[PDB]
């Protein structure tokens, strides 16, 4: 007979989270006062940021300096590149702590990220915002949606998703009880972070770590001040040592070491396509030495489009496109750099764009809150955009309609640029600039279906895309033809501004693996599940009844 | 309108494994189906769309128990055919992807019902004769697990359509679970026809198009499941039936710019060769191809002195010798304590004599038949010669092998006095159960031995009625077995109960038969629709 109080039961835990509300920062608001004081508390001060392995904070000979993008005179952080000895020590110390961390129940791990998210919401919000602004050159709203809202939502929703996952259990028929155990991957996970979002840095390190993995985290050299802050918040959130290792390093050096290590089980990358593709080839050449097949997750690229139909709300189009193309200097994977305008609407859209372009204030985001966006991140990115700006002057099929000038005397300041391309296949319409350069193509209204195919076929990427129409039949047909042209599709909204739980972010084609961070299924890449079958009756005869 | 949409739930149950006793209608139906292969040989073409293509590279599949009987004639797809099959698949992909999940699932549900009802006897017989399976090993494979693979994946795919993001006004958010852009390459092994059906069936179900290379030595059975799907309503050019040379199929699909997936089950070094081939050709792919590999298997039966001794012998005989131990889940390591070993040796070798090896189509008393082909047989003979020749290896039972009429290996039990001997840590795919003997004093050092012996981590069994050591063994052998079994055999993973797969060198552990497997064959798109004008580009805080 079967036990009334025994293995007949099954208990499932849930968690009812909410998106962190986005503060207004209006004149007289206490978050404005708190952020402004936090900004003045970062002025002459350069924070000494060590390579934290366990609790032992190590300094090396390869000392590097993070500067403010809008003021490359003032250095905001002193840090150092971890060498092969420190990276191999970080790996071996992490594996030693992995099995204990993995055996820890999901609720105990989730609580560390929940309490990290709560102090991120309240008393340490102004700190992380200010450090992102002076560190990466964000305005207050760009840092509020990033370092606050998205990072908090990443820690809360991924916690939520990880406890509902434990509830996903298989069917049990007697005499066997079946349970799925959601183990972390066996080994260490390499987390590599981009400059443009501190939240992404927190997700790529935090999400694997949440699932019972150990993480060697290399943050971006130009996002270091804010990246060490979110690391420090996680350590006094109650994260044990050797679970996330703060190991800044030279890109190639980090890449070479973690892909030559026998204990690599995952790479959580966000950045450029060729460096992700290089790591992919490295793990393939070294595939014989690994214990487990390493799981590579990459979010890269984005040559994203705003498609406009003649029926569109023209005022929403220019508001949306100006925000998408130029917010944080268009240094977003989701950023609109392709505007497809119909001939009929072009004079109205061109006129309104150039008028509103003239009202866009570029300056210091710390001293002038009226600033829309500030400098791009570094001299290498500035040079790249400077060559793209002169390409807009040199190329015959291109015309600069607004902006075009840049000056790196004080900071890496690029004017918001609107380029008209008569050629829809011009390299400026294909290659990612990661700067404030919007390319515009005017199409005849007769050939709007041909243009829809042309949006799909032009670029190698498929991350974000928007269509603007109040006609419902064209958005229906635009949805089906651009089904694979955008992993994040927008009807009458800007191609940027992915909120966790509402718009899980990521695209296919050249834009990456599309593992959809901010959605329920992201965490599944960072668990290698086990299933326990326990039979309670003796088995019986090895032979069958047909013999 | 806007704020409502029809979703769908699907409640499925596992297909019941029938008893096949004398008098039963299923046993008579099977042997009347078996007596329809005895003197026939099916001419199996490559199927591209609705076109049956033949090539000069004509090949044969013989019964492993009677290798003089050609039971299927087929042919290898050349470069020209595979590329034709790729482009034709891509032309069919867009309308197939756009087809709602309910309409796609209805094909596999209908296909499952055919395989369970009027086509059950056919697919069992064709599996037994084609691959050398007994009645029951074909029943849990060609019927049950394949029915379950089609029904449970159909369930999991429509439950997934319900998993939608939160909508905050004035925006409404939906996830569209698209198939992968391009074609998926499905490479099936010989051991399970079900796995072949799943490897090509599952990606397809999620709106992908598939080039399916079945195992040469399982062609008859795998072409028969292909034909179930096609007259169950699967349109042309969704699954292309393309038997081919292994390397050349690997070379062609890894060279195609439209590759977006490899659903592999087979040998570990081949999966790595495809991995290397993809990475070497990574620049010319339109997207990052998703590789799903099910490899490996050097699985263990850890016995503690406090175990049901009769469950240990009954389980390990089944796990290690069923379908001649040619399972990824098959037990090849027996860890028995010194105190209990005289009692188990006596019972292992006793039941070894009662094992009947022979024709499974003719003799239903047969426990297991011949191994799959000549190249599999030569490996086992090398190992049976090694079991004789090695100083640490003592052949307790079995030893001989005869390829007179079929590739017949008698079940070999070996006692190893060295637990790090190649026979402990190299995959056989053949009926060699190798045993180590450990002292009851030195038991938890042996529990940590079984973990670090082999590079694999697929399945594993612990036998003990002491509940304190099974909780201890679950914690020690966490990553040594993807499918852990407490007081049950290492084999017989049922879909929806024991999702099959393991980490380490055993593969990518995507858990086919689990709810998450299908998520490797969907690349989700999220649509946000805002129903009010966006307002000004500048914010309140700026003024
Ligand atoms: O008639 P019930 O008291 O409600 O118990 C049965 C149940 C179930 C039963 O199976 P069914 O859905 O096929 O009818 C049964 C029972 C009763 C009737 C059938 C059954 C079968 C069996 C036993 C009791 C029951 C005894 C003899 C046999 C059995 C196997 C293992 C332990 C105990 C038993 C379901 C539903 C229920 C049940 C309970 C469990 C499980 C499954 C069930 C899972 C999880 C737990 C369990 C314990 C041990 C092994 C497996 C399980």
Numbering used by the authors:
A (entry chain A): 16 to 562
B (entry chain B): 21 to 563
Paper text:
The aromatic ring system of these compounds is able to include lysine and arginine side chains, supported by one or two phosphate groups that are attached to the half-moon-shaped molecule. Furthermore, we solved crystal structures of two different tweezer variants in complex with the enzyme Δ1-Pyrroline-5-carboxyl-dehydrogenase (P5CDH) and found that the tweezers are bound to a lysine and methionine side chain, respectively. Therefore, P5CDH was chosen as a target for the systematic analysis of co-crystallization with two different tweezer molecules, the diphosphate tweezer CLR01, which was also used for the 14-3-3 structures, and a monophosphate tweezer, where one phosphate group is replaced by a sterically less-demanding hydroxyl group. In both crystals, only one tweezer molecule is seen in the asymmetric unit despite the presence of two and four monomers of P5CDH, respectively, revealing an asymmetric binding mode of the tweezer to P5CDH, depending on the non-equivalent environment of the tweezer binding sites in the monomers.
P5CDH crystallizes as a tetramer consisting of a dimer of the physiologically relevant dimers with the N-termini of all four molecules in the asymmetric unit packing together in a large cleft between the two dimers formed by chains A and B, or C and D, respectively. Surprisingly, the CLR01 molecule was found in only one copy per tetramer in the asymmetric unit, and instead of binding to a lysine or arginine side chain, as expected, the Met17 of chain A—which actually belongs to artificially introduced linker residues —was seen as the guest inside the aromatic ring. The tweezer bound to monomer A is stabilized by packing against residues of monomer D. Interestingly, the regions around Met17 in monomers B, C, and D are disordered, indicating that the binding of CLR01 has a stabilizing effect on the N-terminus of monomer A, similar to the effect on the binding of a peptide to 14-3-3 described in the previous section. To further validate this binding mode, the anomalous signal of phosphorous and sulfur was measured at a wavelength of 1.698 Å at the synchrotron. Three peaks are observed at 2I/σI, at both phosphate groups of the tweezer and inside the ring system at a position corresponding to the sulfur atom of methionine 17. Although the anomalous signal is relatively weak, this strongly supports the binding mode of the tweezer encircling the Met17 side chain. A more detailed analysis of the tweezer binding modes using the CCP4 PISA software revealed that the largest hydrophobic Van der Waals interactions between the CLR01 and P5CDH monomer A are from the Met17 side chain bound inside the aromatic ring system, which is additionally clamped between two lysine residues that provide the positive charges to the region around the methionine. The interface of CLR01 to monomer A buries 487 Å2 of the solvent-excluded surface and covers about 69% of the tweezer’s surface.
